[PDB]
Amino acid sequence: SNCVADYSVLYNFAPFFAFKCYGVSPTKLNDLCFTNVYADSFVIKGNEVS
């Protein structure tokens, strides 16, 4: 919160197994404003990614 929501760092950081957005398009994230951004970080297996 209280920051500039620049998402180009996510694409620059690494290629990913999956990058699936449900509410918004993955390329519109830098145009929108977000009331509260929460990053839930965890490790799972590939067969559980779905």
Binding site: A5, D31, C33, F34, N36, A39, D40, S41
Partner: protein, 50 residues
């Protein structure tokens, strides 16, 4: 796995992407984007008792 959870409620709080603000124009039909709120109209000084 990182889940970026957020809600879009016409930005009661901002956390906005890397966009650049411009100057206000009043008493003209203009397009506008206020923390993501998008529309077209004539913006005037308000006298509503907020």
């Amino acid at each position: 796995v990182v889940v970026l959870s957020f809600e879009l409620l016409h930005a009661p709080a901002t956390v906005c992407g890397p966009k650049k603000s411009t100057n206000l124009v009043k008493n003209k039909c203009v397009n506008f984007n206020f923390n993501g709120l998008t529309g077209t109209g004539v913006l005037t000084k308000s006298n509503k008792k907020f």
